[PDB]
Design a protein around this ligand. Structure first.
Ligand SMILES: C[C@H](N)c1ccc(Cl)cc1
Length: 117
């Protein structure tokens, strides 16, 4: 059975390498697909810097810090989607935007403890 949180190590991708620049076409779909790719080990993370979001496809799926005081290095996170400037969920600081991973070479791995909600 699925625990409330799962430890994952996500490949961190540079935005210009990403081949599939979002998870879908509605908030509900992107959240659903992100969660599936996270379970399958086929989800990457792009760190948000100036110029990143316009190079990715909306709706966006962010991982945001959900909790403080981070077990074994994995930051606790939850998913929040964004479309047209409106966010679906509320949480803490953004760690990055999730994208499909289809074999791109990462620059780093990001350890997270993901809330499965
Ligand atoms: C497994 C298949 N080649 C696939 C990769 C990425 C996405 Cl987003 C959907 C399907």
């Amino acid at each position: 059975m699925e625990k409330t949180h799962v430890q994952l190590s996500l490949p961190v991708l540079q935005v210009r390498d990403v081949l599939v620049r979002g998870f879908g076409d509605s908030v509900e779909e992107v959240l659903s697909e992100a969660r599936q790719h996270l379970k399958d080990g086929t989800c990457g993370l792009v760190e948000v810097e100036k110029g990143v979001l316009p190079q990715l496809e909306q709706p966006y799926v962010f991982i945001k810090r959900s909790d403080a005081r981070a077990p074994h290095g994995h930051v606790m996170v939850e998913l929040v989607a964004e479309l047209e400037g409106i966010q679906y969920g509320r949480s803490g600081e953004t760690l990055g935007v999730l994208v499909p991973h289809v074999g791109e070479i990462p620059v780093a791995y990001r350890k997270v403890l993901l809330r499965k909600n």
